[PDB]
Amino acid sequence: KGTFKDYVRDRADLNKDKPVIPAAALAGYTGSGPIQLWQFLLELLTDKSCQSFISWTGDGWEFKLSDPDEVARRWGKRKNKPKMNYEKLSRGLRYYYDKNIIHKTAGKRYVYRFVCDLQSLLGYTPEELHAMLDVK
Amino acid sequence: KGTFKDYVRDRADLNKDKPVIPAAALAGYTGSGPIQLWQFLLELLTDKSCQSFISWTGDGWEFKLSDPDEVARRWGKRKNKPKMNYEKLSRGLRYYYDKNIIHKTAGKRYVYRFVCDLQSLLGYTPEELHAMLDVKPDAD
Hints:
Subcellular location (chain B): Nucleus; Cytoplasm
Helix content of chain A: 40-55%
Region (Helix HI-2) (chain B): 23-30
Order of helices and strands of chain A: HHHEEHHEEHH
Region (Helix H4) (chain B): 118-122
Oligomer: homodimer
Family (chain B): Belongs to the ETS family.
Region (Helix H5) (chain B): 126-132
């Protein structure tokens, strides 16, 4: 039976995984208001504890979805959309291909790549972050 | 500006430190779901940057609202309610009076007092928090 003081202390000592690019903070910076799906993928991609169902392939801003539905799940629980499946999220990607935000690598299945200038936006180089995330 | 780094860096070299009792954490702790007005008041009282509009009087869990409107304005923002004024906020305080969470100090204006067992919930004593926030008693 611990107090709030113990609760905070325990949280500071246990759950330790801060994404380098918080989708929320990013929406503020860019002033996009409501969190965007492409901004969310970045947060996950910048959060080690997510390298299970999503990570950088090592080639530039190229990333792959090891477990698509997982990203589709969290995305739903993050935007109060408990009705978010794998397709309702794969439809937003096409919109991203046309607006040239995210693309799909030829000769893959769930491999994608940011084609927008994230270096000038985020301030990080692809290779830089890869290191901060122990990318292999 | 410039890059995302700067906008976040200015938060580590040009930004204060979090309050002691953040409403968000307190909500998750007690599992109240959405932030509660009394939890939000606790955050402002545990944040040095808010001592201009709300502060501890120095006597236990008693506090005063030096700038009532600024409190109601910030509560409105945190809850996405731009039409938030003190009058409505006062409806929440009155509600807490009936639920023995916060009482109003007789013979004074804008002076209230948490009357629930916050010490046992929070893990701090009023004196302890007053020191952490460099609180100075009022010459009542």
